Amino acid sequence: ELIPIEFVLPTSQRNTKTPETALLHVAGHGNVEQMKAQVWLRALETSVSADFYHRLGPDHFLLLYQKKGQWYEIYDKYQVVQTLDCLRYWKVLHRSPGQIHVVQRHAPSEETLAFQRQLNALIGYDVTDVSNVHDDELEFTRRRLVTPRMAEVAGRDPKLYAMHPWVTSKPLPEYLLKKITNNCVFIVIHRSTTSQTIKVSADDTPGTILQSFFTKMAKKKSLMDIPESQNEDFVLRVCGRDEYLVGETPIKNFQWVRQCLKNGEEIHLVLDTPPDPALDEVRKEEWPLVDDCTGVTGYHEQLTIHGKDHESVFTVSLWDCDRKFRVKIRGIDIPVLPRTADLTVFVEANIQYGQQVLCQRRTSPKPFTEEVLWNVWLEFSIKIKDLPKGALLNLQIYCGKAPKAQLLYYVNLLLIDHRFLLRHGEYVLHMWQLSLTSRTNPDKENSMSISILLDNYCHPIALPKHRPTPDPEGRAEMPNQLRKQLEAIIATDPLNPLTAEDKELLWHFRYESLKDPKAYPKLFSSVKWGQQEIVAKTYQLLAKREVWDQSALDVGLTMQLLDCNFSDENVRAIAVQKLESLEDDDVLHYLLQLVQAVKFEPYHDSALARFLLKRGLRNKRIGHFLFWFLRSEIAQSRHYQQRFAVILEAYLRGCGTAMLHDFTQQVQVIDMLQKVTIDIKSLSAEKYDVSSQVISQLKQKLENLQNLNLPQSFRVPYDPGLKAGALVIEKCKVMASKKKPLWLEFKCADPTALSNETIGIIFKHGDDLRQDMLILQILRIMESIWETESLDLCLLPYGCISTGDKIGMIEIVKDATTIAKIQQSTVGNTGAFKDEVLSHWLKEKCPIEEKFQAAVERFVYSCAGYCVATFVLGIGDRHNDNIMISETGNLFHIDFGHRVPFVLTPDFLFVMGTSGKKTSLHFQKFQDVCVKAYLALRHHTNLLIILFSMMLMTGMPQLTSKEDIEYIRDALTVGKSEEDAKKYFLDQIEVCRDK
Amino acid sequence: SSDVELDFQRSVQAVLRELNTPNQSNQGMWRWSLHKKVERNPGKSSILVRILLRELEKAESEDGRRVIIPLLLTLMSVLTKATGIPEDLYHRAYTFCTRLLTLPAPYSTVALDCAIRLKTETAVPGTLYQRTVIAEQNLISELYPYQERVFLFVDPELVSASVCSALLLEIQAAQEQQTPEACMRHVVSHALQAALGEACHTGALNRKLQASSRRVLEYYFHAVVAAIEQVASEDSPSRLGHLEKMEEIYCSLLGPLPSIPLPSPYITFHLWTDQEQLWKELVLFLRPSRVHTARVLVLGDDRMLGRLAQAYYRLRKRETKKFCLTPRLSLQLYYIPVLAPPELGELASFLGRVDPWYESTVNTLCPAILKLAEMPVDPFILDVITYYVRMGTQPIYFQLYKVKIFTSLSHDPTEDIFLTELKVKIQDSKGTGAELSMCYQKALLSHRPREVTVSLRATGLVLKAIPAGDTECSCLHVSVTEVVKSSNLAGRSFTTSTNTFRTSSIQVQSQDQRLLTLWLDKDGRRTFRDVVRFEVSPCPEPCNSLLMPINTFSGIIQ
């Protein structure tokens, strides 16, 4: 099929300034590179400006086409011509010939280079550094992410994006409803120095509220400095916070309003002017758009050599290659040998898909010298046509004593690249040392490397796209016994391994399994991905996933399909498609694991990455937290910094000037505080000594920083609603800890703040806060679960965020004191044995008996919540300095670095009004609340297990293997009756009481 | 018909046994005997084809990779000369070739070349024979202007005069029988026969052609070439249209099975006495796809190869200056080892290890060649040379190395090149060894930069560019004979130890006023005396390192 295409050339006819054109009949089965070469030869033959084409090569030019008024680049030089989106578009328009413009590539402007430098500084990584790549996957992903980013930016309302509200659709729990009288709430609206209280319906929208307000204030505009020319030009914002109340959402569904109702606080709002939308306008994209068909090799019918003339073969289908895969190990070398002089070394080559090893071969052992030469072919028991998309050649270097081999080095090589082409030729891979990523060790000067050779072909070999063919086989009635066995298999928790018999059963009855979404992870775990026919059948099944698409969103199940056990692009794609219905609040709840799951993508560009990019570009809060999560992972994981960095570059390129400025100020503040912390650590010789000299030097350095270098204000990384201003230097101190963190207090920069209270930050350097972040996120998730049961357990999940490698910030919970400090302040060290001390402290803080009883009740609820949480999560090191109580009675735990199941001490029992073994009403309530919360979590065991499994791959010291996660399964008594579970937890309570 | 089939099967099995058991005096004779047998009974060629195809298919099923390329090349050699091959056998061979495209290099590359030729021959039978004869015998044709020539170079100091005279006699005896008129007669006969099969009355055809004047013969030659080339150049060639055109020509010739020999290629024999001889001969060949193909075949040992490398380097350097040969001339290089009855056949050994078919066909020619020189007849050597230059099309590329030689540190260096080896010895002072300073970049598998500077006392050093064994990215293997001082109670004893390393470039300088002698490519005529310093590095492309290609049958079998 010769396709007629008209090419608009960069030169113009001598007499008319009209661009020259060349009509060509291009082989649809050719690639873009050959098409470009044919265009160049034709231009050399026909242009009146031949010297132009003699002086410049084709690579200096882009191939562009117009679609719906926009310009798209034909970017991938190896893309098969017939798969170009432009040809499909023109065929739909009955346009023949189509037009392609050959446009000269220009060098980047100095402004673009400066903006790139700014982006690199924000990222902490240079995404333009090609020094450490074996291919162009990074640049390819940069170009592919242009189109979805620009689609999201183009669909974005800048005014709504500037003021995106923090809301939830979840119904109000009964206990909050009881606080609303006659479905009405009181709101205090502030402007300048004046305020007015109004009574509104809990169902009123901010617009209705504004209309009623302006109607009531019509005769009092001048009093609130409202120009007569202005009308209900204004928005409602939270006092002291950058959080807006806009849209058609009922006032009761705003998170701030729910917080005020939960605490019993008045709802204070400011009547502000809306932010300038121009600050959220995005700079014009210099890059042409890239269509979603870029990198598509096409179908088998277009790539197959069967029935085709050799003249029409430019790419060969991978499914036509009926041979065993092989790799030549040339050898290894290392600049510095291991000190052990009598070691043999051998290479183990594995073909891996996800976590499964499909085949394995090894070289013969040879003496471990600075360089070891094998020069041998290892042929695998897998055919090329059966290689799955995402298959990795995992090379491992093992060492043994010269006559248990210890694994020393490893490296991975993706066999089918991002263009769906089988890799070929010579590779020098720099290997990681062992003290799923296809990235190599960046230390090319000192890291161990392996030289390998893959077969060379006359034509590139491409993985074809699967066509959804109707299955003619798509029923033996499943026997009731096998039905019960399948149901039992489906009912097991995610940690339960599938036997071979389970997998064969699941696959045999795959059509029955497809009727239950809960069977999907197990069914897909039974797929033999190293067999092309089974993979094709699996995709035919995925085409018939109507039950999945129509089902309710189970977030746990959907996230399980993104786990490291599932490397298939289509499975992950249907999971992300399901996640596109997830609300922004819940997305914030799961953002950490969503960021981590990107490590399991075979390529930089994926459905999950695009999902994250979209959600960040739609919601400033999500984008803020996404920025910080990605940046921390960039700073910490050399294995994945590139992937996170390219995703972060796309996001930042979509942010607008306001967000970029905020991020710049934040990073600057972090760098300055890091320098100060390093200086302060160098001044203190001993691990705990905070001498008066150290405090004075801290204050002096902070004063100098405030006067010279700190921004006047910045958004707080752990809470973008908070804006910190000037340091309250007199309140700043070094904390007496091994890591010497800085206690910092800033003034609120928002002039609408109702209290002169400071924003307190513990700045930590040399400490990895990702573990604390995970635990606090899980606590917020547990709170949501309990809220579904109308259980307010009054938890206080404070703000915590990692800002880099072992550097981050923690929120200071105000009016809260460690139990150790209370016990010390009342009677010295013996206070640990004084049951009355905590209750006396709480009564001192709450001298009003009604407030004291409310604090005791809040203590009961928060104690129950944290007891259940620390039990289920196995939180250790619970000394009295790692437990705090607020003056309002909230008990909460801090520092999550890690004889009784949980902390329930006699002084806690005394606050509950128990005396010895006598049960109090508050203690009975404690027991009932504990049981209810425990059972509520037991019902969500699968979600919890999945959330921790997805975090196994962060390198956290206390979450390294699945055995760590089995703790949750055992604590929740999976597989027991609900009565047995209730009794077991009550027994744990009594064990804690007795001990 | 069954006895002839069994006889051919036994011959094919003999070739297969020679290939599977690399155990010397009859190596290569089995293939030659098979080719002679088919030449004596051309009407049985189809028989052999079937056998070969079966064996080929068998080899594919049993993963017998060592026999695929030899059998494939034998099949192609037979098909180039055979007439009356049924179309189904051509389709079977083409299908086999297409299936082999799944094999790694070199199998896929050879199979692709064969598939191209087989497709053209299936649609237009006789194309292979006609094109081969026209190109190799320099027959004038406007529609097929390609010309090929074999240039046979021999060093008279390396190969005896008796060998040269015997080879010259065989070549001249073959060329005296290959007159342009005889070749035109062969092309016409072969084309008409290949197209018409049993409908071609071969006897009447031969009588008519022998009785025709030169003008008539030339007319029919041009008509046949025109028909074949016109049908072959069509987008969709049809065997039926080709048959119709050939029937028209045949009827015009005669009005409304003698074996047709495939002539040996035109071979010019040259005693290599001048370093410029090759250049001059190529320029003369070009004097009135590249239209001309020069197949330069050298007979000799490693010294002859060093000379060929020098000539090749000079040719590339000149081409960068006057661009006169490369737009029109495809240069292919071939090597036949003639070793005196083990250090001078290094490259030969290497080739034999990487291409077993080369080992069994070409490397075994040295005794026969020598035997031919002692004799005061089927041209065995000429047949093997013909087969080699026609079927050996897979190049193996060898890195050339440049050496700068300093006799004094104040004078400009003399530059030369080598291919196989650079040997260095310490000159005797008109006391054992000389202190040498060496600076080199160690060749590691990671390509990590590692510069090494060492000073040691040595008696000699050898840089080898060709790997010695299978356990050995083009790098030099350097062996230094170091003098180690051992102080025993009984006095100062000196022992010699050999240290080996690999490097891409190396600089060596004598420190104790003792001078060095260098030998290039083991050639006593390429000796440099009174040398103080030398530097070796990969030879750059005359403006990428310069690589020299030597054609074999299979290239590098991995």
mmCIF file of C-alpha atoms in Angstrom, chain A residues 305 309-310 320 323 326 330-335 370-373 375 377 379 426 428 444-445 447-449 451 453 455-456 458, chain B residues 60 63 65 94 99-105 108-109 112 116 119 235 442-448 450 470-473 502 558:
data_model
loop_
_atom_site.group_PDB
_atom_site.id
_atom_site.type_symbol
_atom_site.label_atom_id
_atom_site.label_comp_id
_atom_site.label_asym_id
_atom_site.label_seq_id
_atom_site.Cartn_x
_atom_site.Cartn_y
_atom_site.Cartn_z
ATOM 1 C CA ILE A 305 7.037 -11.139 6.918
ATOM 2 C CA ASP A 309 7.938 -9.117 -0.624
ATOM 3 C CA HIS A 310 11.412 -8.506 0.798
ATOM 4 C CA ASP A 320 7.493 -14.278 13.733
ATOM 5 C CA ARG A 323 13.788 -18.972 18.339
ATOM 6 C CA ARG A 326 20.449 -15.800 23.791
ATOM 7 C CA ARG A 330 31.942 -11.230 26.912
ATOM 8 C CA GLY A 331 33.159 -10.646 30.441
ATOM 9 C CA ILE A 332 33.479 -8.341 33.433
ATOM 10 C CA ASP A 333 36.071 -6.075 34.963
ATOM 11 C CA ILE A 334 36.427 -4.060 38.161
ATOM 12 C CA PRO A 335 38.944 -1.282 39.000
ATOM 13 C CA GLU A 370 40.479 -7.354 37.624
ATOM 14 C CA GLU A 371 39.082 -8.618 34.323
ATOM 15 C CA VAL A 372 37.390 -11.965 33.585
ATOM 16 C CA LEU A 373 36.776 -13.068 29.980
ATOM 17 C CA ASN A 375 33.119 -14.757 25.552
ATOM 18 C CA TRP A 377 26.761 -17.575 24.421
ATOM 19 C CA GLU A 379 20.910 -19.649 25.184
ATOM 20 C CA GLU A 426 26.702 -4.498 22.314
ATOM 21 C CA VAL A 428 28.350 -2.216 28.672
ATOM 22 C CA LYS A 444 30.952 4.529 35.585
ATOM 23 C CA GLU A 445 34.495 5.045 36.920
ATOM 24 C CA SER A 447 31.273 0.405 39.753
ATOM 25 C CA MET A 448 31.446 -3.162 38.440
ATOM 26 C CA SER A 449 30.382 -3.585 34.812
ATOM 27 C CA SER A 451 29.932 -6.463 28.667
ATOM 28 C CA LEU A 453 26.263 -8.864 23.108
ATOM 29 C CA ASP A 455 22.069 -10.638 18.259
ATOM 30 C CA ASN A 456 22.064 -8.197 15.350
ATOM 31 C CA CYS A 458 19.058 -6.945 9.201
ATOM 32 C CA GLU B 60 17.211 -26.823 10.778
ATOM 33 C CA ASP B 63 19.818 -27.297 15.390
ATOM 34 C CA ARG B 65 24.052 -24.924 12.736
ATOM 35 C CA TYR B 94 13.179 -19.792 -1.173
ATOM 36 C CA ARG B 99 12.675 -19.336 7.438
ATOM 37 C CA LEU B 100 16.405 -18.939 8.074
ATOM 38 C CA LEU B 101 15.886 -15.177 8.510
ATOM 39 C CA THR B 102 14.984 -16.019 12.087
ATOM 40 C CA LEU B 103 18.605 -17.294 12.657
ATOM 41 C CA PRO B 104 21.191 -14.881 14.074
ATOM 42 C CA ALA B 105 23.983 -13.532 11.983
ATOM 43 C CA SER B 108 20.222 -14.617 8.414
ATOM 44 C CA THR B 109 22.540 -12.482 6.273
ATOM 45 C CA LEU B 112 18.862 -13.054 2.801
ATOM 46 C CA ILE B 116 17.117 -12.420 -3.173
ATOM 47 C CA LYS B 119 13.442 -15.087 -5.997
ATOM 48 C CA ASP B 235 7.795 -4.968 -10.261
ATOM 49 C CA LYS B 442 44.730 -0.988 29.732
ATOM 50 C CA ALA B 443 41.937 -2.570 27.684
ATOM 51 C CA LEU B 444 39.251 -3.543 30.200
ATOM 52 C CA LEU B 445 35.839 -5.070 29.514
ATOM 53 C CA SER B 446 34.075 -2.097 31.150
ATOM 54 C CA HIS B 447 36.023 0.337 28.983
ATOM 55 C CA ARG B 448 37.050 2.045 32.218
ATOM 56 C CA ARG B 450 43.115 2.896 33.182
ATOM 57 C CA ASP B 470 39.034 -19.087 21.931
ATOM 58 C CA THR B 471 39.404 -17.711 25.466
ATOM 59 C CA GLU B 472 40.684 -14.365 24.118
ATOM 60 C CA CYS B 473 36.817 -4.116 21.556
ATOM 61 C CA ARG B 502 45.830 -6.004 26.805
ATOM 62 C CA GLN B 558 29.351 -17.369 17.053
#
